[PDB]
């Protein structure tokens, strides 16, 4: 016969019973976890349900070790993930507790509509049973009532979203299993054998689309009969209904005209993102490829361009969309449906104190010497260069932003510039800082230019609207922007950097664009002298190509020269050759702190906002007067990169604030200003040897 049948080792009633038992029985090492979650959902304090497969595996092992039988729910969900969503939904809708909080004027409209629908359902059921009982023609009575009455289906009464998250390597390794769902893969490795499975991808996000409403079920109304008609949509396009299809209008001769009602319709929040391969995954001599990810529900706005992540999702097919003449059979396109997101580097804004983080932090402070310990851990494979590392750490921490009123604004971000002789490892420090920062970007000279910086005008494929794509300076907003070969750039890029350091914005006035961008970012630049090595026979301003004002626009400007010395060369060579013999740095009395703990401590420190006292202000004014008086004589002799100006005082204040923040204090002390002046003086010993 056409459409023959086949036999599979899959029974769905058994799995439904297992799902119910797990949902009502699981205990976390208090009542059931998911029952408490469902109660919170019922009281309107939760919108999304997360199902962890580790719980399922633990439940299975608990059932096994005590003798009884159980089915492999984890593998069934893994290989056929798209079918279990509705099984879990149906199981959950059968156990949700009644709401213990009344519905009032301060609830969402969706909840009001849902409650009205449920009350209407109950009223119809009661009317039907009363009418049947009054006829004189109890399981059978309820059965017949259920047969003859319409209702609102369960999908139109749900208020939550359900997602799965994969099996972690730890649980599978401890339970002796192979967690397929959490083995990262590149876009290259994902072939057609993985369709219909729950898989994880590692990559870097390149594009994200704005959130828009995607319709799931449309609603109409008939003034003739008073029914509500629902039309499911699962396609890129659909045809609206015209005439009523309800039982009453269907049986009659004069049917009513349907009208669309947006408020009763079912919508979803939709985003589509592109993910690209990492360099270490691309083969030799090839170009990286991409992939498509769909995000729905409460998981939207969880991805921003430039993030290296591990996305989890179900790999599903889609209809073919290429040229017709090149279609050979039933070809398809692929996409990923997102279920869980994790980041390789946590953002500072999402910080939160908790026992786990607090213990690590308290350990760090207890160990003492936080300042130097953090400073020495930045690129520990580079010998020497301690004060530059302290300045870099302070650039990581930053100062305090002040709102003065009347709309005036003063930045709190610190800009640092390194400039020295060839072969002093400036690029290594640039790259290491870019890697430590959670929103860091790295650029080198003429490779990035024009719209590579700033932004350009393009058209969105998903939506039919125009947009702006940010460049290097917009991608590192609220981060560090590293610029290599600073002196070899074009004038336009220099002007853009100038404005960004000035007021954290970029203004563009060109054909088709008149707007202002946000550039809340710090600058870390590297440069070389105009004739290769530094020439001590020339004025400092004659050894560099940048304008003097631009140099003056940096809080810290470092000079790094290479004067041969038979002693320090021995130590540097020993360090480098040891680093090449092994894979570690040579010191044993000092242990470096890994990037995650540094990021955690900096995130904790960034929540502070120390303040200026009076004695510190007196000290600051005295120091400023003395330094300003001294600098003029030096600059008259043509032996100064630049005369001291109020920007020097502002930089001193910012550095003192940064040190106070790093100490985890609510007030500033004299020692902080001491260290700030100490560093600003150290900035230029290379020019006095």
């Amino acid at each position: 016969a056409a459409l023959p049948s086949i036999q599979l080792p899959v029974d769905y009633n058994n799995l439904f019973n297992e799902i119910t038992d797990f949902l009502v029985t699981f205990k976390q090492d208090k009542g059931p976890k998911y029952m408490a979650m469902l109660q919170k959902v019922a009281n309107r304090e939760l919108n999304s349900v997360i199902i962890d497969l580790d719980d399922i595996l633990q439940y299975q092992n608990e059932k096994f070790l005590q003798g009884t039988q159980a089915d492999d729910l984890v593998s069934a969900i893994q290989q056929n993930a798209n079918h279990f969503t509705e099984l879990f939904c149906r199981a959950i809708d059968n156990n949700m507790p009644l709401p213990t909080k009344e519905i009032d004027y301060k609830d969402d409209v969706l909840d009001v509509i849902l409650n009205q629908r449920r009350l209407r359902n109950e009223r119809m059921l009661s009317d039907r049973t009363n009418e049947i009982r009054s006829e004189n023609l109890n399981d059978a009575l309820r059965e017949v009532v259920e047969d003859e009455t319409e209702l609102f289906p369960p999908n139109l009464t749900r208020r939550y979203f359900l997602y799965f998250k994969p099996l972690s390597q730890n649980c599978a390794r401890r339970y002796r299993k192979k967690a397929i769902s959490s083995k990262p893969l590149s876009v290259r490795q994902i072939k057609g054998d993985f369709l219909g499975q729950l898989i994880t991808v590692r990559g870097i996000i390149t594009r994200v689309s704005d959130v828009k409403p995607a319709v799931e079920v449309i609603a109409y109304t008939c003034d003739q009969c008073g029914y509500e008609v629902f039309q499911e949509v699962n396609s890129r396009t659909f045809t609206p209904l015209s005439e009523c299809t309800s039982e009453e209008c269907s049986q009659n001769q004069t049917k009513g005209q349907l009208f669309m009602s947006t408020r009763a319709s079912k919508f979803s929040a939709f985003q589509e993102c592109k993910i690209q391969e990492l360099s270490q995954q691309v083969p030799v001599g090839h170009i990286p490829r991409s992939l498509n990810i769909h995000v729905n529900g409460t998981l939207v706005r969880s991805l921003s361009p430039g993030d290296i992540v591990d996305v989890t999702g179900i790999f599903l097919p889609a209809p073919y969309t290429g040229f017709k003449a090149l279609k050979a059979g039933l070809l398809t396109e692929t996409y990923l449906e997102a279920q869980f997101v994790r980041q390789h580097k946590k953002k500072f804004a999402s910080f939160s104190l908790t026992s786990d983080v607090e213990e690590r932090v308290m350990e760090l402070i207890t160990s003492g010497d936080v300042y130097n310990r953090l400073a020495k851990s930045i690129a520990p494979e580079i010998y020497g260069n301690l004060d530059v590392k302290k300045a870099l750490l302070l650039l990581l921490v930053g100062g305090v932003d002040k709102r003065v009123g009347d709309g005036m604004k003063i930045r709190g971000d610190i800009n640092v510039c390194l400039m020295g002789d060839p072969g002093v490892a400036k690029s290594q420090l640039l790259k290491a800082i870019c890697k430590i920062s959670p929103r860091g970007v790295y650029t080198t000279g003429k490779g990035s230019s024009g719209v590579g910086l700033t932004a350009a005008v393009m058209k969105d494929p998903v939506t039919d609207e125009m947009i702006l794509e940010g460049g290097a300076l917009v991608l590192a907003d609220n981060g560090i922007c590293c610029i290599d070969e600073f002196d070899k750039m074009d004038e336009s890029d220099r002007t853009a950097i100038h404005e960004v350091m000035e007021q954290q914005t970029i203004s563009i006035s060109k054909a088709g664009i008149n707007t202002t961008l946000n550039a809340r970012t710090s600058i870390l630049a590297a440069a070389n002298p105009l004739y290769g090595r530094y020439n001590p026979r020339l004025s400092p301003l004659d050894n560099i190509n940048l304008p003097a004002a631009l140099l003056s626009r940096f809080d810290i400007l470092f000079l790094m020269l290479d004067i041969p010395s038979r002693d320090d060369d021995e130590k540097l060579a020993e360090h480098v050759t040891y680093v090449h013999m092994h894979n570690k740095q040579p010191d044993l009395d000092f242990t470096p702190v890994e990037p995650s703990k540094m990021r955690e401590y900096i995130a904790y420190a960034k929540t502070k906002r120390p303040v200026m006292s009076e004695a510190v202000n007196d000290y600051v004014v005295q120091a400023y007067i003395r330094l300003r008086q001294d600098s003029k004589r030096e600059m008259d002799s043509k032996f100064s990169f630049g005369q001291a100006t109020p920007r020097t005082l502002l930089g001193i204040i910012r550095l003192s604030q940064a040190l106070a923040k790093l100490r985890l204090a609510d007030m500033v002390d004299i020692d902080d200003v001491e260290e700030a002046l100490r560093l600003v003086r150290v900035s230029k010993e290379s020019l006095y040897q």
Partner: protein
């Protein structure tokens, strides 16, 4: 490889006043006649 979408309905409001010459009212009237009519104090049609 999607499946076929569905359509369904449910009653909420009260539409226009029913007319006498419409099919649903005819069906309801005939149902009442079948289940109620009496002859010699007997439900002849329901019983048969």
């Amino acid at each position: 490889s999607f499946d076929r979408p569905e359509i369904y309905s449910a009653p909420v409001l009260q539409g226009e006043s029913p007319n006498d010459d419409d099919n649903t009212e005819i069906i309801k009237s005939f149902k009442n006649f079948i289940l109620e009519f009496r002859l010699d104090s007997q439900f002849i049609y329901r019983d048969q």
